[PDB]
Amino acid sequence: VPKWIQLNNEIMIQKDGKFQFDKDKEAVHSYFVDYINQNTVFFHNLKEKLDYLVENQYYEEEFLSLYSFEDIKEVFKTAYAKKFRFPSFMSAFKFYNDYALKTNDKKKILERYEDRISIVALFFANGDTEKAKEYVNLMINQEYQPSTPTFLNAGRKRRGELVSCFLLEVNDSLNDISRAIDISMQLSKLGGGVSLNLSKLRAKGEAIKDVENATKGVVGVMKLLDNAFRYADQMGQRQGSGAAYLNIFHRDINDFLDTKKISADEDVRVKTLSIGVVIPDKFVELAREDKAAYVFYPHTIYKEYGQHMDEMDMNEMYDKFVDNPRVKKEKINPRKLLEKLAMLRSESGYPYIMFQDNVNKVHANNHISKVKFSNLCSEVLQASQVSSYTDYDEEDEIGLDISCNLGSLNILNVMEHKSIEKTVKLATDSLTHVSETTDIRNAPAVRRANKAMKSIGLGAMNLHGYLAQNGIAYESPEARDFANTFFMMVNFYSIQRSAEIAKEKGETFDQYEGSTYATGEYFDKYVSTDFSPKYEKIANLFEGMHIPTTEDWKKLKAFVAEHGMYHSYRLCIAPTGSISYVQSSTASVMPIMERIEERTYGNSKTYYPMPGLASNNWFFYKEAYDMDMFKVVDMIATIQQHIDQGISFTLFLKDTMTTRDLNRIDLYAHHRGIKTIYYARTK
Amino acid sequence: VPKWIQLNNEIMIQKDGKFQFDKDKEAVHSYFVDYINQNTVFFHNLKEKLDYLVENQYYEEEFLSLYSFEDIKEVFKTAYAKKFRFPSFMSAFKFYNDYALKTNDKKKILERYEDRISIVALFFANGDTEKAKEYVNLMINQEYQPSTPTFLNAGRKRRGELVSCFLLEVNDSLNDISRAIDISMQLSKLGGGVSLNLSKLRAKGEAIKDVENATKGVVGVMKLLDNAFRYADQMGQRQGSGAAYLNIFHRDINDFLDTKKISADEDVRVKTLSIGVVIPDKFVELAREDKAAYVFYPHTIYKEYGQHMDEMDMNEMYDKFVDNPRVKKEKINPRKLLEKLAMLRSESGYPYIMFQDNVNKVHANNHISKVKFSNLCSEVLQASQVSSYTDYDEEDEIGLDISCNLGSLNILNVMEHKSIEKTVKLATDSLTHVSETTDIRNAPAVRRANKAMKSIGLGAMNLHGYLAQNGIAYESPEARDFANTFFMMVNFYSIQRSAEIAKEKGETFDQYEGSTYATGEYFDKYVSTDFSPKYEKIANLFEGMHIPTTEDWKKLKAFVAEHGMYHSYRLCIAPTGSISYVQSSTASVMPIMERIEERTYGNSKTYYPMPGLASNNWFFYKEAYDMDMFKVVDMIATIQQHIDQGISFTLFLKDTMTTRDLNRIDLYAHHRGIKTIYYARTK
Amino acid sequence: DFTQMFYNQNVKQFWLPEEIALNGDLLTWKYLGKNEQDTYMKVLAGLTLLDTEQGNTGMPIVAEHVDGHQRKAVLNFMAMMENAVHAKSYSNIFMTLAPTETINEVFEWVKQNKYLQKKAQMIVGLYKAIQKDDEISLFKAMVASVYLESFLFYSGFYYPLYFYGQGKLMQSGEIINLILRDEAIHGVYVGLLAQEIYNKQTEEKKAELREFAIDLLNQLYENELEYTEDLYDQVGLSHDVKKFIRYNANKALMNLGFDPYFEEEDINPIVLNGLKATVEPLKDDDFYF
Amino acid sequence: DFTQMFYNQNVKQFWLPEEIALNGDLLTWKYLGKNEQDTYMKVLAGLTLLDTEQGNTGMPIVAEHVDGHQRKAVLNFMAMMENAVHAKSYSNIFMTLAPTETINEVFEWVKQNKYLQKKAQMIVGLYKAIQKDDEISLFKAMVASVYLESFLFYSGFYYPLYFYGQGKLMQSGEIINLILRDEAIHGVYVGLLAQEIYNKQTEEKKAELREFAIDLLNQLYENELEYTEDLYDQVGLSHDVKKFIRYNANKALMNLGFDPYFEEEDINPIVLNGLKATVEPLKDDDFYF
C-alpha cells in the first residue's frame, strides 16, 4: 500500500470522535512527493517540452502555431504563477489518471494541471495571448471547467471529438434507420454519447409497402442500435453508451419499456442502450382524470395527416387521433403506465422522463421545432428536424441533429471571486470556439445543426458544496433564493455574451428571427419579475457583484432585439461526472449522495470527503437520499426557470419508499415545471 | 382431413407388398376437382382477368403494354394448349401454395400454372410474341425453370427482386462496415440472400489509428450483420438469411468458427448468419505435411504490402508473410483446424467450404479479381472488387459486388425433348433479360457489377431423376459419363448463346479482353479432349442430338475470339429447393435424400415420392446417405469441370461415420477439383 | 432433454411476497357480501392447506427418489417456492383480510371439512407409499403431484381469478396469479418426470398405469364436484367452476402425456380476463489418393 | 427468537451466478501456471462435491426432521442455494475458463480422489443415520453439517480468496465471496439448532456429545491435512492453507457453542484482503399539489 493511500484511509480513523479530514491534504502532498513528481517528465525548458509533444504526435501544430513561443511561455507562466494545489487526494488522482497527458507506454506523466490548463486556454483563444491568459486565470482559479471531452482532448492530436452529447432524429424508413445506425457508430467512435429519437418510427405490426403486420417496431431498431453501440466502444476503452427516446403515446411504449425489465428475454432486452420516455401533458391529464388513454400507430397518423405523431401537439391532436377511424390505436391505462414507469425506475433507474410541454412552454425555438427528446444525460433540450436519408445516388434532405457544447461553472469558485459575469462570458466564448472548431464529416445533420444553431451548454456545479460551506441547507428556501439569483445572473450574462458575439460577428443563429428572443417574449418574466435575493444572507453572499434588475433586463432585451443572439441555446446543466473531482466540487447542481465516498481502485481503497466537509458543516452536507425529494424538485425547478435547456435531475430514493412515492415525485416535478428527470438511484 | 390428403397418404398403405404410387395421381385430381378449381377465380375472358390483375396492383402494366391483347391471348392459348397436368399432388400443392398468385386476403387463386408461365414468358420476351411463345413452350414442357424469385415475382406489381443471391465485399473500415450492414438490410428487404466477405476486416486485437488491441474482429461485424438480417426478414414472412465468409488464414478463423459451436456464449453465438470458410491450397498443403501453420492479422499485411491478405495469392506469399517481422501472425495447427471444421460440420452443417485454388485455377476472370468467397448457397464463384465507401460528402469508390440470376434446366425434360441447345439458349436469353431489367438503387456495387459483369447462373435439376428413370446408378461411371457429356453440351451452347448475344448487341462484359475466353485458354481442354459419351447406353441417350466435338469447340472458340462473350459467368448450379417440387424433379444435381419424403403441412402429413419412383426403379433411386460420398464427389467434379461457377454440393453423411471420414471426404473433394462444399447433412 | 430449460424458467420466475402491497384490497373487500367473503376465506384456506402438504412432503419426497443432480436442484427450487414464498404469501393475504380469531376459525372449519380432507389425504397417501428404488410407486406419486399442481388447485384458484377479472381484490389476485404460474410449471415438470418412468415400462404395464391414472382422476373429480357445490352454490357459480375443473383436468392429463378425458368447453370470460460425431484424428495418408 | 431474522437474511441474500459476467477473468486465468490452474480446478471441484451433497441430502434431511414451518422454510431455502445456486456456479466458472476435456477430467478426478471420497462418506453417512424422533442422531448430523459449512469448505475457499486478494480472477472471486457469505450464515443457523438439542441433555450426555464433536473434528481434520497437501504442495501453499483451516475449525466449534481447539496463528494477509420494489396504486390525490 502506497503512503498517500494510507494517509487517505487515515481519514476514516476517528480522532477525538472526529474524522481526520486534514489528513487528506497530507495525502495529496505524498501523492505528489512520492508518485506524481517521480513519474512526471521534465524538460530543460518549455520550448523542448512543446517540441517533444508536437513531434511525438501528442499535440496539434495548428493551435500552437497561432502564437509566438513568447506568448505560449507567458501563458504557461500565468498558469504556474497561481501555484495551484489540489486540496484533496482524489482531485489530483482523478486528474492524473483521467486527464493528464501520458506517454504512449502510459508510465510517465507529460502534462501537469497547469500544462493541461495552458494548452486548453491556448486552444480556446485561437491566437489571442491576452484571451489565453484570461482563460488560464479562469481555469486555474477553477471558476470554469470545460467538459471532459474538451478538457481532455483540447490541443491533442490523438483525440476524439470535443462534443460528446449527440441527439439524432430517425425517420421512419430502412434507409434512415441504417443511416442512424451508421451515424451512431461514427459518433461513438468519436467518443460521444448518442441519443436517438425513435418516436417517428412506426410501431410493431404496421405496414411496409401495403403489406400488413410487417414492421418489427422500435424494439428491433433498439436491438440494432444496441449492437452498434456495443461494437463502437471507443476502440475498446469505454463501454459504448447510447440512449433511445420514445413518446409515451407511441404504441411500442410498453415493449420499449419491456426492454429494461429483468424478466425480458435475450431477444427483447437491450443492455447498453439507455431508454427515455417523452411524456406530453396530455398523458398526465389522462392519468390524472383516470380516463383510459390510447397509444397510436405512428404510420397511420402519418398517412392520415402527412406529419409524424411526435411532430404535432398531442394536446390538440389526441382527440382527433382517437376520433379518426383511419388512425389505428390501442387502449391503455395511463395510471398503469405511470406505475410501470415508476417500477422500472425503481428496478433499474430507467427510463428517463421528458415532460414535453414543460420543455416546450418555455422553449425559445418552437418555430424551428418543438423539443421532442433529450440526450443520454437528459439535459439537452433543443429543436431538431428529422432528415430524409434517401437511397444511394439520390440527394438526402439533411435536417438538424442536436449536438451542444458542454462546460460547467464552479459556483463556489465563481461566487467567491465575485466574477459571475466574467466567468460566464469567457465560458460562452470558449464554448463558441469549440462549437466552431467542431467538424464531423460522418454526421451530416449534426454538422449542419452545429453550423446553424451554434448551440452551447453552459452548466454549473458545486451548488451543494457552495451552499454547505456557507451554512445553507440544500432544501432551505434560502438555497432556492440563491439558486434563483445566481442562475438568473448566469442567464443574463449568457444572453448578453451571445448578443455581443452576434453583434461582433454580424450573424445570429439560423431562424433566430422566429425565436422568442427576437420577439422579446423570452424576456417577459425578466422585465416584470425581480430576481434579486429575498433573504439578507443571500444578498450578502452576492455582495460585491451587480445583480441585474428589471431595467437591466429591459436593456438586454433591447440589445438582443437590435443585435440578435448568436447561440440558439446557451445553458444546460450536465451531470459533470469526473471533472467535479478535479475541480474539488460536488457533481452538477445535484445534492451530494454521500458525505465521504469509498472507492476501490485496483486492489486499494480510497476515501473522498465532499469538498470543504468538516465538523462545522457536516450537518449542512446532508446526503441526497436523506433529503425530501419535493424540495430537491423545487430547487431544480427554481434553477430550470433560468436555464433554456434542461438539467440532469437524478432522483435519490430510499429503499423504503414505493412506486407511489416515485410517481408522486415525478408528478410534482411535472407540476413544478421540471423538464427532465434523469435517474432514480435507490440507496 | 381432405380427400386428396387421404389419397396421398394411401401411397404408403402397401397393396400386395408394393407402394401405391398411382394413388398419388388420384390425389392431384382430387386436389384440383375439390380445392383448386373451386378456389380459382374465373373471368369471362382473358381481357377481364388481365384488367382486374392490372388495376388491382397485381401485375405491372408496363411489360403487358408491350404486347397487343391478341398476342397475349395467343401466348396464353399456347400455354393452355399443352394441357399440362401435375403428375404428383405435391407439385401442384407447392405451386399453388408458394408460387401461384392469390388475392390480397389470400382466400382465392388468381393464377394457374399456365397463367404464371404465360406471365413469366411475356416478361421474358419483352415485346416479342414469338419469343414469348418459345418461353411458354419451354416452361410448360418444364424444360427450363426460372428461379423462385424470377418465377414467383416476374410481372408482379407487389414483387421483390428477381435476383436470388447477392455477394458483398466488406472493406476494413467503419464506414464500409456500416454500408455493408445497410446494403445487407436493403437486399434482405428485397428478398435476396446476402453473402459478405469478412476476410478484409482486420482481426481482433488490431489497431484503429495507433491505439492497439482495439478492434472487435470479424465477430463483432458478424453480430452486427446477424442483427441486421434478423431485422430485415422479408417483412416477417421468410427469416432473413445471411452468409459470412472468412479466409482460413484470417486470425479470427477460430472465433469465426466459434460462432457456430453449440456451446458458444450469447455474446459470440450467431444464429441467423451462415458461415463459410475459404481454404487456399496452401492450408491443405500445410495440413497434409503436418507443419504448423500461421493465421495472419489482415491490417498488418495491408500496412506492409498495401494490399489485403485475401487480395493476393497465399500459395506464393505465405512464406513472405511468415518471414516478415512487420506482419503479425498466430501459430495454429492446420490439422486441428481441419478437425474443428469437420466437427462443426457434423454438429451444425457449418461452415461452407470454398477451395479457393480449385475455384481460381479454372476461373476465367482472374484478371478482374480472384474469387475470394461464395454466396449463401456456396455455388456462386465470381470476381469481386471491394468498394471504398468513404465519409459523408466524399465520393465513394464503387467496386464490384457479385449478383447473378438463377435458372435451372430440367435434365429429364431437356433430354426427353432432345433440346439441350434450344433450352440452353432460351434460358440464357431469359437470364440476360432478368439481369438487364434488374436495377437495385440501394446497392451501388451490386448495380455496377450487374451492369458490367452481366453474370447469369444457369443451373440444372433432375440429374438423379433422369439417371434413375433411365436405369443408371448415380454412382456408376455411366452416370458420370452422362453428366460429362450433358454439361459439356450445356457449356458449349451457353458459350455460343453468350457470344451470339455479344455479337447482336456489339458489347461484351466489362474487362472481357483479359479473360481466358478472349485469350482462348478457356477452350483448351475443349479443343484437345473429346467429351462424347464413352458408353453405348449414354450415347443412345444422347441420340437425336448433335454432341459437340473438338471441331465444334474450335469453331466456338474462333467465334468467341471474333465476337466476345456477353456474360462473364453463365452456369451455376443452385440447390433449387422448393421449385424442384413444381417441376417434378429431384433437387439440383444432388442425389435424392429419401425415396419418399414425409412432410407435415398444417395438421396434416403428406408423402412425396421421388419423380418417377416405382418398383422397377426403386433401387436406382438410391438415397444419398446410403451412397459413397467419394463417388458423389466424383460426379460433382465431373459436372464442375464444365461449370464456370460452383455447384451447391451438400454432403450426405451417416451418424456412424466420424469427423475423420468428413475430413477425408473434404480432402478428396479438394483433390478432385471441387470448388465449394455446401452442407454436411447427417442422417 | 428438459431439466436445464426448466431450471432457467423456474429461477427467472423468482418472486417474494413483500413485492405486492396488500392493504389496498380492503377497499374492495369491505364491499363483498357475507357469502362472498365466506367462500373466499374457505377457498383460500383450502389452497393453503394443500400447498403446505406439497411443500413439506410432495416436492421433497419426489426430490429424494428422483436420480440426477440437476433434477434434484430444480425440485429443491420448487420445494423452496412452496415453503418460503407461497406459504408466506397465503399467510399475508389472510392476515390482511381477516382478524386473527377469524383466521383460526376458518382453518378449524376447513381442517374438518369432508371434501377438502378427502382429496388432501388421497394425495398424501400416495406420497407416503413411495418405496426406495421402486419407480412404479414413484410414478404413482408423480401422478398425484401433477393432479394437485395442475388440477386440484383450480377449483380454488377460480374465485380469486373471478374477482381479479372484475377489478376486485387486485393485490391478492396478483399474488394468486404468481402462485398459479409457479404451480403450472411445477405440474409440467413433474409430468415430464412421470412420462420418463412411464416410457420405460412394457405395454401391459403402461396400460395398467393408464388405468391407475384415470381411476385416480375419476375419484378426485367426483370429490371436486362435491367440494365445488359445497363452496360455490351460495354464490351461484358452481356450473362455471365445474367447466374450469374439467378444462384443468385435461391440462393435467396432457402433462402426463395422456389424452384429454373431457370434451372441450369454453371458460367463464371474467376468469379468463383474470388468467456430436465421434472425433477421430487425421492419421495422414488421408491427404493422398 | 432467531428463525425469522435468518429467513429475512437468507431471502435478501438471494443471487444467481449469471448476475456476474465471467469473461473478465479470461486473461488472469490464461496467465497462471499449469500447477496453479490444476489446483484451482480441483479445489472448486471439491467444493462442487460438498455442495452437491449438502443440497441433495444434508439440508433436505435436516429440514425433514426439524419441527416448525418457518424453520423448515429456512432450511429448504438453504438447500436450494446449495444445489441450485452454489454447486451450479462452479460449472459457470469451469465453462468459462476451461475446455470440456479438462472439465470432464476434473469431475473424474473427484470420483477417484480418496480424501474427497472419505469426507463425503463420513458426512453423508451421518446424514443418512438420522432416525425419526431421535434428537441425538439429528444432533450428530447437524454437527457434521456445521463442520461442512464452517470448516471443510475452507481448504477450497482459500485459493479463490488468495487470488481475489491479489487482484486476480476477481469475477470468479466475487462468486466465491457470495457463496462464502451464504455458508457463514448457514453454519451459524445449523449451529443454533444443534445447541438447542445439546442443551436438552444431562451433563453426562453433554460430555459424550462433546467427545463425539471433537473426535469427529479431529478425524475430518487429519483427512483434510492430507487433502490440503495433495492439492497445495504443487503451488507451495500447504502450510498457509493449514493455518486457515484451523482458524475456521475454531469458528465451526464456536458455531456449536464450544471453546476453540486450535491455537491462533497469523493468516496470509492476502487472503484477509480476499474477504423489485413495493408497488402502490396511484390515488387521485397524488395528481394534485
Ligand SMILES: Nc1ncnc2c1ncn2[C@@H]1O[C@H](COP(=O)(O)OP(=O)(O)OP(=O)(O)O)[C@@H](O)[C@H]1O
Ligand atoms: N497539494 C498539491 N497539489 C499540487 N501539487 C502539489 C501539491 N503538493 C505538492 N505538489 C507539487 O510538489 C511540489 C513540492 O511542493 P512542496 O509542498 O514540497 O513545496 P513548494 O514550496 O510548493 O515547492 P516548489 O519549490 O516545488 O514550488 C510543488 O511545487 C508541486 O509541483
Ligand SMILES: Nc1ncnc2c1ncn2[C@@H]1O[C@H](COP(=O)(O)OP(=O)(O)OP(=O)(O)O)[C@@H](O)[C@H]1O
Ligand atoms: N393433375 C392436374 N394438373 C393440372 N390441372 C388439373 C389436374 N387434374 C385436374 N386438373 C384441372 O381440373 C380439370 C378437371 O378436368 P379433368 O382433368 O378431370 O378432365 P376433363 O373434365 O375430361 O377435361 P380435361 O382433362 O380435357 O381438362 C382439368 O380440366 C384441369 O383444368
Ligand SMILES: Cc1cn([C@H]2C[C@H](O)[C@@H](COP(=O)(O)OP(=O)(O)OP(=O)(O)O)O2)c(=O)[nH]c1=O
Ligand atoms: C470504429 C471501430 C473500428 N473497428 C475496426 C473495424 C474496422 O474494420 C477497422 C477499421 O476502422 P476504420 O473506420 O478504418 O477506422 P480509422 O480509419 O479511423 O482507423 P485506420 O486509419 O487505422 O483505418 O476498425 C472496431 O472494431 N470497432 C470500432 O469501434
Ligand SMILES: [Mg+2]
Ligand atoms: Mg418509407
Ligand SMILES: [Mg+2]
Ligand atoms: Mg480506415
Ligand SMILES: [Mn+2]
Ligand atoms: Mn405452492
Ligand SMILES: [Mn+2]
Ligand atoms: Mn407447486
Ligand SMILES: [Mn+2]
Ligand atoms: Mn453451499
Ligand SMILES: [Mn+2]
Ligand atoms: Mn451451506
